[PDB]
Design a protein around this nucleic acid. Structure first.
Lengths: 50, 48, 80, 123, 106, 141, 75
RNA sequence: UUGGAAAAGAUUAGCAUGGCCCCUGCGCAAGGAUGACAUUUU
């Protein structure tokens, strides 16, 4: 089967209900704080462990 | 998302890196001038 | 088969929702009814309207007084 | 049809037969399949067996008349397996169905009338 | 209250097309919708003192049966140089938002 | 000897560009016996039915169709130009000119992403899109 | 109709035709005046070039025949 | 009140219709058990 034509979404224009479950599957309520951050000044780990 | 969109989404941190180190990368000592002023903006961009 | 009953019902209902939204799209009527004492007093009058419309759709199509009689007759009177 | 398919239900009788088989599918009195009809004939819980004359080869259900003579059960052949299969609530062709006895179920009068009618067909 | 809304109405239905190319479409839109539903009136909003097109346009159709097929077929259809986007006309004038404000408090 | 279709005069090329309303007309301007055009046509053939939902690929001989030589500046062995709805889609590849490809890329995924970029930026309306890679350096290490 | 009938505008000189010595392939002439005396003249000049290549013609053409034969024999 | 000079429309989110199931009511189809002492209306 060929690649689908790369159209974007029309879009999600309605919200809540099904759509919160649609994101609760995979893009759910994350930490949204101190897991997506790097903390500019400090080094919290040992320096080049990565 | 498409392979090209995944490529661009992974080049986003290169954008924030380049914008971060812009005052020392976009100077005239670093790239000898072919000083192109940015359009409708007073920024000169030494080097493409 | 029961899967075909589900498919036939769901496609008849899909064209029913499609033609009701079609009649909204033409603009004949505003859309139907979507569903501290004042707000649920409004929605109490509207759910009274909703239960009343259910009793209206049961009030017509009711086998009034003698359609029961003719259907009991065509049940009991065979084709001798 | 097949001459060994005997007795063969005519159109009015097979309409009543398929409606009774449909009602027995609804009332869970129906066992579809030649092996399940063979089982409910062996267990003696079968009211009557319908079969399909357009089963190729026919002999994969022609043991069922003999079982219906060793169990005293009425048997009758419907014209085609596709109509019988749809009358069992499945889209696949079913060649042999067993309408079975249940505890005082409401189809017993219809089943008795169809039993008296399809024991008139073998004549 | 602009004195120009009264040229389409005969209790007929208006489709709203927007995202249209401002370099053209003055009568291109009429040309495209013309096959559907016999001579009709279709305007394009080109604002004055400039001669520039503001985007959107209003095509008034005779039937809401005609409207559904027209809308479904010409949604995103290449017209002049931008794909048209289609919605239903607002016409939120005085005599309906007075009714809307009266329906707010009820 | 390709399974890709060929256009043999200026009318076939201009009507092949005007034929498509929702797909990128990918046109290779070059000669089939050229090694650069042979590798580029191998890349275009290996993706021709991948990108068929949003592109079409045409080969054009420069000797057979020489009228686009001056306007499109077809002076390199292969050029690959991209059109969408009669508009010539330029691409900032990093090569210095944006109008054509003008070399044979060996990665078929890079050609898929270039066509996909041209499609995304052309349905959005840009006449110039930016390639999702910089082809100024050959990235050999 | 030309390539302008597309509604197009620009934004054999191909590099396959180019060569760093000899310039572009293809001759500038071959049109414009070829006649009686032009044909007799290039008969004379082609005899002169053939005569100049008659110096080593046996050994050169023998070497070229042997080299293309063994080049087709090997690869 | 009067005179006058001057993104090719995005993203995030809530409700409802939609799906499903149970039950109730109505209908459609088939049932089940039972109770009752041609002359005159032009």
């Amino acid at each position: 089967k060929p690649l689908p034509a790369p159209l974007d979404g029309q879009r999600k224009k309605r919200g809540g209900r099904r759509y919160r479950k649609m994101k609760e599957r995979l893009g759910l309520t994350e930490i949204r704080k101190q897991a997506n951050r790097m903390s500019f000044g400090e080094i919290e780990e040992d320096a080049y462990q990565e | 998302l498409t392979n090209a969109q995944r490529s661009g989404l992974n080049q986003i941190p290169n954008r924030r890196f380049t914008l971060w180190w812009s005052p020392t990368i976009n100077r005239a000592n670093v790239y000898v001038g072919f000083q192109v002023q940015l359009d409708l903006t007073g920024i000169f961009m030494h080097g493409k | 088969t029961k899967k075909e009953q589900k498919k036939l019902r769901r496609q008849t209902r899909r064209e029913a929702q499609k033609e009701l939204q079609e009649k909204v799209r033409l603009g004949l009527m505003p859309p139907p009814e979507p569903k501290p004492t004042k707000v649920e007093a409004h929605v109490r009058a509207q759910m009274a309207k909703r239960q009343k419309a259910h009793e209206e759709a049961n009030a017509a199509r009711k086998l009034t007084a003698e359609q029961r009689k003719v259907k009991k007759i065509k049940k009991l009177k065979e084709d001798i | 049809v097949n001459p060994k398919a005997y007795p063969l239900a005519d159109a009015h009788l097979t309409k009543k037969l398929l409606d009774l088989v449909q009602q027995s599918c609804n009332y869970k009195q129906l066992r579809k399949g030649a092996n399940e009809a063979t089982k409910t004939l062996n267990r003696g819980i079968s009211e009557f067996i319908v079969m399909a004359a357009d089963a190729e080869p026919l002999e994969i259900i022609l043991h069922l008349p003999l079982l219906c003579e060793d169990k005293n059960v009425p048997y009758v052949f419907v014209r085609s397996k596709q109509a019988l299969g749809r009358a069992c609530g499945v889209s696949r062709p079913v060649i042999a169905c067993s309408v079975t006895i249940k505890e005082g179920s409401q189809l017993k009068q219809q089943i008795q009338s169809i039993q008296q009618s399809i024991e008139r067909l073998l004549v | 209250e602009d004195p120009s809304l009264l040229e389409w109405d005969a209790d007929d239905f208006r489709i709203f097309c927007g995202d249209l190319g401002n370099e053209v479409n003055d009568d291109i839109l009429a040309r495209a919708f013309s096959r559907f539903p016999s001579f009709l009136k279709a305007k394009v909003i080109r604002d004055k003192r400039t001669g520039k097109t503001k985007g959107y346009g209003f095509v008034s159709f005779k039937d809401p049966s005609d409207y559904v097929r027209a809308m479904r077929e010409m949604n995103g259809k290449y017209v002049g140089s931008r794909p048209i986007k289609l919605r239903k006309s607002m016409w939120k004038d005085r005599n309906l938002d007075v009714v809307r404000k009266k329906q707010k408090e009820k | 000897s390709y399974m890709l279709p060929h256009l043999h005069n200026g009318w076939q090329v201009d009507q092949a560009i005007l034929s498509e309303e929702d797909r990128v007309v990918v046109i290779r301007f070059g000669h089939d016996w050229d090694p650069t055009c042979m590798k580029m046509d191998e890349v275009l053939y290996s993706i021709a039915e991948k990108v068929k939902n949003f592109a079409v690929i045409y080969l054009v001989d420069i000797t057979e169709v020489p009228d686009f030589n001056k306007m499109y500046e077809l002076y390199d062995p292969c050029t690959v130009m991209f059109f969408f709805r009669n508009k010539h889609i330029m691409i900032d590849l990093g090569t210095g000119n944006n109008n054509k490809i003008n070399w044979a890329m060996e990665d078929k995924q890079e050609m898929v992403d270039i066509i996909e970029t041209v499609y995304r930026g052309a349905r959005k309306g840009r006449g110039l899109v930016v390639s999702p890679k910089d082809y100024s350096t050959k990235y050999r290490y | 109709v030309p390539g302008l009938g597309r509604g197009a505008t620009g934004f054999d000189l191909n590099d396959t035709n180019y060569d760093e010595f000899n310039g572009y392939a293809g001759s500038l002439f071959s049109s414009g005046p070829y006649e009686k005396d032009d044909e007799e003249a290039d008969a004379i000049y082609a005899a002169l070039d053939k005569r100049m290549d008659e110096r080593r013609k046996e050994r050169r053409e023998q070497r070229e025949k042997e080299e293309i034969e063994k080049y087709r024999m090997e690869r």
